[model samples]
Target chain A: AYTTFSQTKNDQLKEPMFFGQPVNVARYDQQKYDIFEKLIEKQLSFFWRPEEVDVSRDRIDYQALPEHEKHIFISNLKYQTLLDSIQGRSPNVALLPLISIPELETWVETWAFSETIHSRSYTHIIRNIVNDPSVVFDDIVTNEQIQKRAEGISSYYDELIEMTSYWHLLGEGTHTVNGKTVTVSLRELKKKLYLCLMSVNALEAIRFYVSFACSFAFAERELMEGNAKIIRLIARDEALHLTGTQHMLNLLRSGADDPEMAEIAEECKQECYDLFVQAAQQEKDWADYLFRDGSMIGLNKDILCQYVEYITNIRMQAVGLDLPFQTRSNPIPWINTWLVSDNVQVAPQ
Target chain B: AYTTFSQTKNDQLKEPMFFGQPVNVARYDQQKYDIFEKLIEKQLSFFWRPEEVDVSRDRIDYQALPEHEKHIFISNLKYQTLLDSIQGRSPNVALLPLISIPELETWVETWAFSETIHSRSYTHIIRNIVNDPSVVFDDIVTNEQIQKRAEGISSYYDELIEMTSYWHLLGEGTHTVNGKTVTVSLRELKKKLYLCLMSVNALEAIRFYVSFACSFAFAERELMEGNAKIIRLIARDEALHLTGTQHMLNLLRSGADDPEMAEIAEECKQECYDLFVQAAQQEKDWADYLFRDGSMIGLNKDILCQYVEYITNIRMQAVGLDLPFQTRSNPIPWINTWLVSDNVQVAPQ
Candidate 1:
């Protein structure tokens, strides 16, 4: 049932986004969601390399900053590297097998491949900014703050990976594996998928948006603009990624793509809502750690926390989750100049 | 043991190609194989869109061709679509979860994503050449010849997919699932993977090359040059793909990166050898089906069979398999001017 190429030629447009027949013929002339097709074309058009941006000049600026501002800067770079490392292959590992539509399958691979470019950019930034990149790449694994950030983000994707591995092997029924009677259900798998997608939505929506704030914050001070240029390009692509995620999540919950998933979506609504709030809370904690040494000129822990809350509210509402933050305006409206493009407007009004 | 993000923080340089810790940090500054890193960069450099190629003139060319030529061309195009649609996602689906190194993981994803571009070009050729693409897509599934091509190619990938799913879920044990005793072993899983890579290598090296021979054959007569222009670009990428596959296969057999797979590679040497010969024979049979009605001026059943033997011998030697055919030179020497490029030379001499 989970074969790589389904020999049965079924209607391409009639399949759901996932857990239907694995896409046999990769076609874009017909689709279940043309939005994914559009997203894929939009993404391929923005093809870029990290080496295109010159970050050599940022090495001079980095040596002049106080240790605290340097802490804020290096910490954010560390977190961004960790985030992209996960996004680099997690979608392909956990989600590719589950995807039923060709457009969505290609979108996930495209989305994951772009993160490798983003991950490579961090190496560019680190090598150019430091005399030796060992301390930086080393700290990426040892830092406790980023460790929690890493632990928090990987939970949903890991859960999905394990469940699906079992789902594919043993299938939907009771199985005795090493003295443990494990039960599997399609409804349970659907629920976990919905939550994993919600987690991914919050990841791009709030988690990465927060990192972009830190990257742009340094740019506002006229320092590290080289790194900021790369970040801006990534944010543009990330905006497309978030838009694709929200659209997929919305389609699933609307009960149109998956009939049983409509029931699954309703059952997990509160849990989904709480995940958004929890993710926002983690960012607030992250802001505390990033600015623990001191505040920067244009951004502080309080300011970054508010931006997280504001964006969290907006993104949560996009995927049918209730807004977790209070009514507030965009704290860093200047950041919109860096993030929003026609890409985010790809979804329906 | 299976995870989307391995939190162990192990050194990325020390991991195997598969069945090691899941890659946690995606770094290209260092790699177990520099060839994969080079492959990643080379693929990113050639980013393209199908819509960019104007195939509108091919419709006129189709109208001018004789009925048998039309059958040959359309049949070749149908088989090409099936080849790419499988390549488009099969790599990511069957190989991504088993990959443990960042560079190779990204390379596999990059390889798979490029195939999506190739798959899209089929739509471009179809929609431009026909008012309705339905009949073309319909025949893709219903055609007995292409269906055999599809079944033969997907077999290796599906077997690996099933075995790896069991390997991950049960992990080297005999487990009862739905009253069935299932035994899984790492050695068995590695053998399956080795055979699958051989299958993929032959698919790119022979199956796609055979289709390209047909496409370029038509171009030799000055018909369907527009479609040939599109295929020429893909053949360039396919050359890079075959180079990557051969390098990986060679490395595994050398006992460098994976000690166990080195033994496994030697153990399955004959099976691997047989697959290449089997694949070559299939292409020979397909040549008869292709030129059943009649043959073109430059290409016929005999000519295509010789080309299949010629290229299959070259490719099998690249992967350490015995040549199954009499030594011969390149039959379609003109095809090299279109296929060979700097991208394929990324591997070390």
Candidate 2:
């Protein structure tokens, strides 16, 4: 049941997004959903390396910043590193086994591969600006603030992966494990996947954009241009990634691929809405931590919180979820200048 | 327990390649295994787009070939597509959850990503050569010869993945699963990981090179030069992938990272040797199938078998396995011209 090359001779166009036959052939000739194919082509076209960007001047720029400002910059970078660290591997680990369509399978891999490059960009930026990167990298795991945020982001992926393993190993039914009854249901699994995608959507849509605001805010002050440049490329790639997940979620909700997924989406709508709100609240809590030392000139806890609400409303609305916050105007409109790539427009609407 | 982001505060340098701690922060400032970091850097440097290569001429050249030559060229491309199709997804599915180091984690994703590019290149080549690309891509799963080889390749990844799920979910203990007693041991899981790596090493080191020979043989006759060009780039990236797995195998066997893995490697040496031998024999059998329609210029069944034996001996010795075939000179020395890149060289000695 868990074979890598499933041997079912079925039309790929007829398969669901997941829980169908595994993709045996990697073909781009035709697709049931051409969006994934388009995303794959677009992502490959957006490929760029981190070393190609020059960050040599960031070291000097970091040396002159105040203690609180340095704290803001490095902490934000560390949080970004944590986000990508999980994203770099989680999508493929969590999603590949269940993927049924060839286009979607390759899209997930391409999306994750881009995240690894983003992870590398962090290492590149950290090594150039900081004297000892270990202190920053190591704190990502031990720091209470970062770890708390990591818990929210990773819990969804980890749960889905575990449930998926059970479903694959033992088909949907009740099972006795160490004298305890555990039931594995495909319907519950689909629900898990739905909520997981919502969580991932929040991570990519809301959490990442928050960090990007911080990165871009520095460049707006005429500092850390090189770091901002590398992040800009990452932001461009992330835009496509968020779009990929949004499409997956919306397609499932519309019942275009699987009718069961549509029912599950309807049943989980409130849970999905709560997940977004929880993530937005978590991001605001993270904002408090990011500025606990002190706020920078252009970005502060209040402004960043407003930006989170603004972005959250737009992203949730895109996926058919009711907005979680007031439809406020953009907090820092200038950040759009930095994120104004053809692929990434910070103002989602 | 399985965690997407482990909050443990241990030094990352102290972690093993697999089954140590799930990588929390993806930092490349330092690596416990610098070889993986080097491979990641080198692979990033080798980033390529398949569409950039001109495969249009191959369509005309393919049409000009004799019936037997066409059979040889198309069948070889189908097999290459099969291999990449499995590889493009397997490494991430089988390896990501168990990876313990940041550098190695990123390397696996990078390695898998490059294989997706290779998979895309196959689609690019297939679409250009045939009028209906579906006929070729669909045959990959149903073709008996390719399916036989895919079985051997995908089983290693599948087994490791299943055992890993149990280890992550049920920690190393006895449990009742569906009314049957099951024992999941970390030692067994470690052995599975080792053999899986050995199988992957054989695939990259021996299986892919064999396919490269057939593709290059066509180019040697001044035909299908475009397909040859794409494969050449793929071969260059494959060199880094094989090196990555080879380093992982050697490092584990050397007791540098985990004493338990060193012992596990010693315990599984014979199993590992047998796995390589089985893959080599499968490749030889595939060569027989490829040339069944008739042999092409510069490459026949006998020559391909000899080349498989020759390369198998070299790859085996690289990871401390005793040579299983008679050591001999290169079967096709002209392949060096195509594989001649700074990072990839065929001759071990």
Model number with the top TM-score:
2
Query: Looking at model 2 chain B, which ten-residue stretch has the lowest summed lDDT?
Result: B340-349
Where does model 1 exceed 4 Å of error? A1-349, B342-349
| Model 2 misplaced regions, further than 4 Å | A343-347, B1-349
Error of 2 at B81 (Å): 80
TM-score of chain B of each: 0.97, 0.98
List model 1 lDDT by residue over A59-113, tens digit each: 8878756566678899999989998999998999999989889999999999999
What are the per-model DockQ values?
0.00, 0.00
DockQ of 2: 0.00
**How do the residues B241-316 of candidate 2 rate in per-residue lDDT, one tens digit apiece?**
8988999999989998888999999998999999999999999998888877556446888889999999999999
lDDT of 1 by residue, B187-206 (tens): 98888888899999999988
Model 1: lDDT of residue B230: 90
